[PDB]
Amino acid sequence: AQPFAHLTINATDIPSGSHKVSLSSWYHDRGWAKISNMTFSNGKLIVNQDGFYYLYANICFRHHETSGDLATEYLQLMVYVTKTSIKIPSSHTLMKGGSTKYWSGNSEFHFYSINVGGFFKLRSGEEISIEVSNPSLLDPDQDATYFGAFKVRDID
Amino acid sequence: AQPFAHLTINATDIPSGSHKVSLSSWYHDRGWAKISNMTFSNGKLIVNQDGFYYLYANICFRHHETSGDLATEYLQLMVYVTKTSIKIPSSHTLMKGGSTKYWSGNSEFHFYSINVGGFFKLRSGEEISIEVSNPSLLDPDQDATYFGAFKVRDID
Amino acid sequence: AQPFAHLTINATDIPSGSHKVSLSSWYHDRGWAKISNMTFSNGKLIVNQDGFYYLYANICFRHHETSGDLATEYLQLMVYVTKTSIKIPSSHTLMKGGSTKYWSGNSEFHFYSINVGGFFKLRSGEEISIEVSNPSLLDPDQDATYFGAFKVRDID
Amino acid sequence: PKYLHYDEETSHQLLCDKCPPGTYLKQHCTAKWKTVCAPCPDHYYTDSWHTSDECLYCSPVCKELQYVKQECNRTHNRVCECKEGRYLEIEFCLKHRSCPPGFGVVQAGTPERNTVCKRCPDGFFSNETSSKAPCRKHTNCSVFGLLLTQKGNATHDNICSHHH
Amino acid sequence: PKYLHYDEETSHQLLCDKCPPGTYLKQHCTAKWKTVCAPCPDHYYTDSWHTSDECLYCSPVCKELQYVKQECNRTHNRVCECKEGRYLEIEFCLKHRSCPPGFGVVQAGTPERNTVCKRCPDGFFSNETSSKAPCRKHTNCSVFGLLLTQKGNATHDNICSHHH
Amino acid sequence: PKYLHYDEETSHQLLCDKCPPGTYLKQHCTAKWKTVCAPCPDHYYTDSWHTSDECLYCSPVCKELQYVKQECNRTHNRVCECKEGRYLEIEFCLKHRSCPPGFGVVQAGTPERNTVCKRCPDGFFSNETSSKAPCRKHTNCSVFGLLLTQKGNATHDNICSHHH
Ligand SMILES: *[C@@H]1O[C@H](CO)[C@@H](O)[C@H](O)[C@H]1NC(C)=O
Ligand SMILES: *[C@@H]1O[C@H](CO)[C@@H](O)[C@H](O)[C@H]1NC(C)=O
Ligand SMILES: *[C@@H]1O[C@H](CO)[C@@H](O)[C@H](O)[C@H]1NC(C)=O
């Protein structure tokens, strides 16, 4: 009765895109990917039980060019954690992170991670989702790209 | 009886400064900004109840020059989470983070975030405060610049 | 009966090394360094009690050259949080973070931090360990370089 | 009507009024009791008729090269937009792509999307680098008016004097 | 045997069989009851005989310049290795160090370690920059074959014609 | 006195002694019982008289270009300072600003603050780039000594020979 989730990227199905793009593809029941009394559905983590949750997210970006430079060298690497609901169709951002980055051709490899976390009042039916820029650069490792939640408190 | 806080930057009143500068301006009761059984006073988050708290902070820095370069291009972007008390006037740093950064004129925009978190024994009357370098570069978004705490345990 | 740990780097004994190197040297009982119902032994944090723990780590890297450049300017700055056991000798990575970095000679100083956190099912006898690249660049401050854990839930 | 909805007090299920944009719901109707709708607090709002007990926070703050198109009312959320020439790209307002002296705008950049350029098909052209200007088709000197003088490529129109 | 272990049911302490690589343990033996060993789930595995009720997740994913040497079986974990010429350095597969036209390979780079170079001692040499080639010793013209013609340094062999 | 404070045991409110710098408080006085003050542990300290049951951890570690001015006693916290020429700027010890051959030090850089430079007002000057040297005023040849020979700007003194 103390719900949690830890979802790890499922690199099988990662989209290309040139804005904030939604990440719908996650494991919920494998390796570190675990879920309890919440539901992962249609790309979002659903809250089943009112309460205060700690939300967090770790996103890794990486590139290794066999030779030459990146096609574009100046990058925005960002993550957005959003809250949505059936009723409040419109998404609202809970947490944001990342960095602009110059991945120059002077080096053939590049790595960067983002971490965010925060305490949030959630009600059943509310849903958490992840968006990132430059999804194709994502590290597909379960220890690298993941997000999660655990209930800490009741409301009252 | 399980105290928490999540304070979001109030960009209304942000100071200029060339060292570690104290951030006294935060919302405590609006949007994601919530507080329970702790008090936000004179710029600091006061603990009302002994216990172990998870403390955390997310700070975003950003600049977009309409044209040309930054006045200074090499930056220290740092956050410091400090513990103070009435009795122990002197501040002590609980957590520190950030990065040196070269925000060159080769790009007209720049973004960087810092995240820190940690588990800490707090007693009533103790106070948490935030300091950062280069405050004028702060992102004023509630999803961007915030810090917080929640009680996890009793002492014993 | 709700175990925790917050271990801060003991800079007394930091290794040199050119891959992922294990950090065995930590304080467990001083300043912010606290431990309860877990044991810190042979470099690893041992779990004594089943449950779900939040794990986290903050690592700071820093260099200040009195003059000239770094010997190598392109760096991988990474942290790895690993789970091991007596029985499962092989380590598995729970969380990973960091950044490639160009610490050029254009500036005589450089600082970078990494933060990671995550929710994990642990059983007694399991052990958490930290590895990093470029250990000699580590910030030795208790507010800078530390990792930790606290029990949130029972298994069931 | 003003628009109603079910509640189901102790006895039956009732037709209660919905709360108007600009308000939140304080008390459900109860037969002899109407829906009690209060105005939103100072920084919150609601677009439409609804039933939530809570209002929405106006968000987020506008970025540097953005301007407040719609101020934050009890009825509307703030709306921020990138100034002329710029679209919102992730965290920043960036100048629309310039379509090279070779190509033409096929999709108007907006405050949310870059201008999409393309190549001028056979029989079209553009003499300039513009973020706004489309591919214009070769003027047909041949018929209306005069005669051809210089074939037009993808970068150049037909030059068409009136002497052979 | 297949290999046994203690359990200690209500009464005594029993000799139960261990679970084979490829399986996890579902039920402890009980005298008249054997060790019940199930196969691992679709992405898990076990190398050796054992007793854990749980299996291991195959991990991690291979990096860009890596290839799957050993695929993930119910019996083995995936094994990823850096392609020829490269060793795993922290997060990436990097080309082995080239040993300068002066020096020679003293420790073969592997998929896990860089090639270690050193200086060619007195009486040795290498004419090339190779990530693979060792220090070869000065060919002794003196004896077998002919005579010396040019002393060899650390970069050059003895040049040894057959005329004084 | 040694200095006392209220406690208020079961019955009354008592005058207990305070604990000296170098100690923490173990037991409150009780009439016939004195304040029991223990020394701080190996890495802790206390500056002043006080009443806390806990001591303070010596902190933080010194940075690269810093030196330990005051070592960590049971009575004092460690004190780290930037070496000559440098002030602590956020995370690092940086060289004091050099005041251009035009300007002068108006605020001595310290181990905590940069040197503040300014412009030499009318009638002052500095011939050098110094992080330490102030604006010196034009030497008045006119009176004491000789005569003027060259007007002095903000970068140059009066050149004052003794022939008209
Ligand atoms: C199109 O016409 C212009 C002017 O005649 C000429 O300079 C240009 O090269 C032509 N385009 C191409 C690539 O043929
Ligand atoms: C070794 O021999 C080569 C060819 O004779 C010569 O060019 C080179 O300088 C020699 N090495 C040194 C450093 O003496
Ligand atoms: C001040 O005097 C020096 C020497 O006469 C001269 O070179 C300099 O230009 C003067 N300063 C200015 C800017 O007038």
DSSP assignment of D109-138 equals: --SSSPPEEEE--TTEE-SS-BSSPPPEEP
The SS3 call for residue F144 is coil
Question: Which of E82, E104, E127 is the endpoint of a domain?
Answer: E82
Say if residue F64 is in the same domain as residue F101: no
Across-strand partners of A102?
A74
Nearest in space to D46 (alpha carbons), one of D68, D69, D74: D74
Query: Which DSSP string corresponds to F72-110?
Result: --SSS--EEEEPTTEEEETTEEEEPPPBPTTEEEEE---
Across-strand partners of C79?
C97, C132
In whole angstroms, give the CA distance from residue C3 to residue F36. Answer: 32
Question: Which of E82, E112, E140 is the endpoint of a domain?
Answer: E82
**Residue of the nearest CA to atom 12 in ligand 3?**
F153
Nearest in space to A61 (alpha carbons), one of C123, C100, B89: C100
In whole angstroms, give the CA distance from residue A97 to residue A77. Answer: 8
Q: Is A90 on the interface with E (CB under 8 A)?
A: no
Residues F101-121: b if buried by 16+ CB within 10 A, e if exposed: ebbbbeeebebeebbebeebe
F17 φ, ψ to 5°? -75, 150
Q: How many domains does the structure of chain A reveal?
A: 1
* Min Cα separation B141/chain A (Å): 9
Say if residue F16 is in the same domain as residue F72: yes
Say if residue E93 is in the same domain as residue E40: no
- Chains touching chain E through at least 3 C-beta pairs below 8 angstroms are A, C
Pairing of strands E56-57, B126-132: unpaired
Say if residue F110 is in the same domain as residue F36: no
Say if residue E88 is in the same domain as residue E161: yes
**Residue of the nearest CA to atom 3 in ligand 2?**
E156
Q: Is C93 on the interface with E (CB under 8 A)?
A: yes
For residues B11, B12, B18 and B22, what is the CA-based torsion angle, rounded to 10 degrees?
Answer: -80
The CATH number for B150's domain is 2.60.120.40
Q: At how many Å resolution was this determined?
A: 2.7
Say if residue D110 is in the same domain as residue D148: yes
The CATH number for D71's domain is 2.10.50.10
Question: Which of D37, D57, D82 is the endpoint of a domain?
Answer: D82
Domain that holds residue A81: 1-156
Domain that holds residue E161: 83-164
The answer to whether the Cβ–Cβ distance between F89 and B93 falls below 8 Å is no
Q: How many domains does the structure of chain F reveal?
A: 2
- The neighbour count for residue C89, using CB atoms within 10 Å, is 7
Q: Report how far ligand 2's centroid is from the alpha carbon of E161 (Å).
A: 18
Closest partner residue to B78 (CB to CB) among F57, F60, F91 is F91
In whole angstroms, give the CA distance from residue A144 to residue D59. Answer: 30
Ligand 3 proximity of F18 Cβ (cutoff 6 Å): no
* Min Cα separation D123/chain A (Å): 32
**Residue of the nearest CA to atom 4 in ligand 2?**
E156
Say if residue F96 is in the same domain as residue F67: no
Query: Which DSSP string corresponds to B77-134?
Result: EEEEEEEEESS--S-EEEEEEEEEEE--TT-SEEEEEEEEEEEEEE-TTEEEEEEES-
- Chains touching chain F through at least 3 C-beta pairs below 8 angstroms are B, C
- Residues of chain A with C-beta less than 8 angstroms from the C-beta of D56: 88, 92
Prior bond of C15 cis (ω within 30°): no
Say if residue D91 is in the same domain as residue D161: yes
How far, rounded to the nearest angstrom, does the alpha carbon of residue B110 sit from its chain's CA centroid?
Answer: 20
Do residues C56 and B117 lie in contact, with contact meaning Cβ atoms separated by under 8 Å? yes
Q: Is C19 on the interface with E (CB under 8 A)?
A: yes
A135 φ, ψ to 5°? -60, -35
Two tokens, residue A154: 């009741």
Q: Which of E127, E151, E155 to mutate to test the pocket of ligand 2 (most atoms within 8 A of CB)?
A: E155
Two tokens, residue E114: 């860089």
Do residues C13 and C140 lie in contact, with contact meaning Cβ atoms separated by under 8 Å? no
Say if residue F108 is in the same domain as residue F121: yes
- The neighbour count for residue A96, using CB atoms within 10 Å, is 27
Do residues C27 and C8 lie in contact, with contact meaning Cβ atoms separated by under 8 Å? yes
